[PDB]
């Protein structure tokens, strides 16, 4: 109903219906209820279709009592060639006892055999945050302050060309800059977090909402994201909503966003957040 494109779900079966095959459809009036979100309903298993039906009555024995259950595959021998050597699916077993005799009735059968990123997003506001300094709105990575030395001083500070403050990077990885700042959408800090880079999601959640993306030449890590919408092994592109900055159900109801990535990815991320072009 949303697009009205009249999608077909299965190959037609116009067998023994007629020689035309271009004027009729050979179907029913009521459609099947669709169960999956995007995939279509599976084709009838076919193992529920009976091609042969066999009625078996026999003198009950102990082996025919314990081993004759519908979970077993029957093999009848010393009979007609089309019966011998085939697995018979037991539809039902009945054990009657009218006198000292035990009688068995077996109903059995034979089943039939076999892009870089999103287009447009709403304009975001990005606020660089530091533990000591006040949070300030920024337009690019050039105007910012480095974040603190987190839990063991994994940060190191270098000097770059256009940055108005020392640049923070992971110890031993100059390329991998690390920053802590707050996203905003119309003044809301619970806004969805678009993906800063395109790649494969390798790990989600953990102690502090760690979304990890393998971009093929480096890793992009995000911390303090709640209500993660992406699963491990999923493919995401630039601007994909990875989750929410803060959950609605008041899970401390306030925090910033932590991001480790190389310089180009972070610069393009800030530019896309401000301009809205992804």
């Amino acid at each position: 109903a949303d697009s009205g494109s009249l999608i077909k779900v299965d190959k037609d079966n116009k067998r023994e219906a007629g020689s035309a095959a271009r004027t009729f459809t050979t179907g029913v009036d009521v459609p099947q209820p669709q169960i999956q979100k995007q995939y279509s309903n599976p084709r009838p298993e076919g193992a529920s279709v009976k091609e042969f039906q066999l009625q078996l009555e026999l003198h009950t024995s102990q082996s025919d009592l314990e081993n004759l259950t519908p979970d077993t595959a029957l093999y009848i021998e010393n009979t007609l060639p089309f019966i011998v050597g085939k697995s018979w699916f037991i539809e039902s077993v009945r054990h009657s006892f009218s006198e000292g005799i035990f009688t068995s009735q077996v109903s059995a059968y034979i089943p039939v055999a076999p892009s870089q990123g999103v287009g447009k997003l709403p304009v975001y506001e990005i606020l660089s945050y530091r533990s000591g300094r006040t949070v300030k709105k920024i337009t690019s990575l050039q105007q910012s302050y480095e974040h603190w030395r987190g839990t063991g001083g994994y940060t190191a500070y270098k000097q770059l060309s256009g940055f108005s403050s020392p640049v923070s990077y992971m110890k031993g990885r100059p390329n991998q800059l690390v920053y802590d700042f707050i996203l905003q959408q119309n003044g809301n800090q619970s806004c969805p977090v678009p993906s800063p880079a395109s790649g494969r999601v390798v790990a989600t959640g953990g102690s502090n909402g760690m979304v990890k993306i393998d971009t093929g030449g480096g890793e992009v890590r995000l911390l303090h994201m709640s209500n993660i919408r992406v699963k491990p092994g999923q493919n995401v592109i630039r601007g994909t909503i990875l989750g929410t900055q803060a959950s609605v159900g008041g899970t401390s109801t306030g925090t910033h966003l932590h991001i480790e990535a190389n310089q180009f990815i972070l610069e393009s991320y800030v530019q896309s957040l401000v301009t809205g072009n992804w």
């Binding site: 023994e16 300030k136 800090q189 109801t253």
Partner: protein
């Protein structure tokens, strides 16, 4: 020839044409190395222009070799026309693998692949384009700029002015969430507000009116009358900074004109370099209501209509299942010759449909066969017929199965009827019954006759004596309680009153 292909064909003609005619119509008659255009009648006379055998002819510089190569895939190309030249250029784009990169806006790779066909295009890593016919000032960046300009010009022609309130999604079952927080209404242009939870008795042990523990560092507020969960943008007039708070509490102090009371964290979120919100106890703020929304985009009903049209054309196609390979002797003909006094043999024909066997000692095999009408009753169909008589409809149905028709009377002309989830035999039964006809099958031929009290041409008379063994005659009173709905239809019961 979407705007992308149109713009690319321009980017090609901008350098592959004669000077001064890159977007002009006369550029379709350009000649390589010459500013003189070839004859206007030649491009229509047919085949390829012979007037210049060796030189490249057309808006896109092509020879007869490229023309033949295009005709190998598009035989409808019979002359050298601007439409035909455009189609040939599109074919060359297809063959040189330029289309896949052009359809996803990879113009660098598209130009690189097109440089192998046209000598004026530079290649990636070589501004000579695997040839040396690249003019001065011709670069990939300049060609990209020209293509962008042409694409913008083409897009501006069909640029609409309506706006879309929804977003496309692949499936009805699939759902998407909002992406934008849109301001709904202005609660107060300027009102006084205060922050609570800072150097006061309000700690994490208190319970908000929401039923949640109070987090002083959270971005929340207490409002006098708004429902809980309402998102309010609070803008501080001092620094023009706005923060969205979630109304959860109801507020304890009432005071006067105090619509909202921010939390400590919400007030801290309003601070800016040189402006501390906590420093001023009372903040003159503006209150607005925001809500999650889908961003309003350009109306795409015109593209959706084209998508629906092409899907409608594509769904009507041969996508049926192939015939099942079943090696067996089951479905054969059963021919029966029977006689009682050897004076004459009566012959009947049936189609085998079932088999039974008792294996242990009673070696018994039972075969079952049915008339050819069983073939008509095998598959449920959906179809429609218009302006066809009963005889014509029966003839088409029988021809679909290789049967013969025996029906002297034509019957009435059916103007409009639909077979809805019915077998061919069932539809034939309904159509014959509604017209007072009945069918019968002998051998291969199906015969349709009138249901009249005098229709049995031959008469056969027997005597109860010396021949028969049993005779039971029964009579019943008609009633609508028993029988089927069709039985009461054949009786007086019918919808006499209908609406036009």
């Amino acid at each position: 020839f979407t705007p992308k292909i149109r713009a690319f064909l321009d980017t090609i003609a901008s350098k592959e044409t004669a000077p001064g005619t890159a977007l002009n119509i006369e550029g379709y008659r350009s000649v390589s190395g010459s500013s003189t255009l070839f004859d206007e009648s030649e491009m229509v006379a047919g085949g390829f222009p012979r007037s210049q055998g060796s030189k490249n002819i057309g808006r896109y510089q092509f020879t007869v070799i490229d023309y033949n190569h295009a005709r190998s895939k598009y035989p409808n190309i019979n002359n050298y026309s601007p439409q035909n030249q455009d189609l040939l250029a599109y074919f060359k784009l297809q063959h040189r693998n330029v289309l896949p990169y052009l359809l996803r806006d990879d113009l660098d790779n598209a130009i690189d692949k097109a440089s192998y066909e046209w000598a004026s295009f530079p290649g990636i890593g070589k501004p000579q384009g695997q040839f040396n016919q690249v003019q001065s000032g011709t670069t990939i960046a300049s060609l990209k700029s020209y293509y962008e300009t042409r694409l913008a010009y083409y897009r501006s022609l069909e640029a609409g002015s309506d706006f879309q309130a929804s977003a496309p999604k692949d499936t009805t079952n699939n759902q998407y969430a909002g992406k934008e927080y849109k301001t709904i209404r202005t609660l107060s242009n300027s009102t006084t507000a205060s922050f609570y939870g800072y150097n006061d008795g309000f700690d994490s042990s208190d319970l908000t009116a929401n039923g949640e523990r109070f987090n002083p560092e959270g971005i929340t507020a207490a409002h006098e009358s708004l429902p809980f969960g309402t998102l309010v943008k609070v803008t501080w007039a001092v620094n023009n900074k706005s923060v969205v708070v979630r109304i959860n509490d109801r507020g304890a102090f009432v005071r006067l004109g105090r619509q909202i009371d921010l939390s400590y964290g919400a007030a801290k979120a309003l601070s800016s370099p040189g402006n501390d919100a906590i420093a001023a106890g009372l903040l003159t703020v503006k209150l607005e209501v925001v809500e999650l929304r889908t961003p309003i985009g350009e109306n795409l009903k015109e593209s959706a209509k084209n998508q629906i049209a092409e899907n409608l054309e594509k769904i009507k196609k041969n996508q049926k299942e192939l015939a099942t390979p079943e090696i067996s002797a089951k479905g054969t003909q059963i021919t029966l010759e029977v006689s009682i006094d050897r004076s004459a043999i009566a012959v009947f024909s049936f189609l085998h449909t079932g088999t039974k066997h008792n294996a242990i000692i009673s070696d018994t095999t039972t075969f079952t066969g049915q008339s050819v009408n069983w073939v008509l009753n095998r598959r449920v169909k959906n179809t429609r017929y218009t302006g066809v008589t009963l005889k014509g409809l029966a003839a088409t149905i029988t021809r679909q199965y290789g049967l013969d028709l025996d029906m002297s009377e034509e019957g009435e002309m059916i103007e409009n009827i639909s077979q809805v989830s019915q077998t061919d035999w069932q539809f034939l039964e309904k159509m014959t019954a509604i017209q007072g006809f009945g069918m019968r099958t002998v051998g291969k031929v199906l015969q349709i006759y009138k249901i009249t009290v005098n229709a049995k041409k031959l008469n056969y008379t027997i005597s109860v004596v010396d021949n028969v063994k049993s005779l039971i005659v029964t009579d019943q009173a008609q009633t609508d309680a028993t029988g089927s709905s069709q039985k009461i239809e054949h009786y007086g019961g019918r919808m006499t009153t209908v609406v036009d």
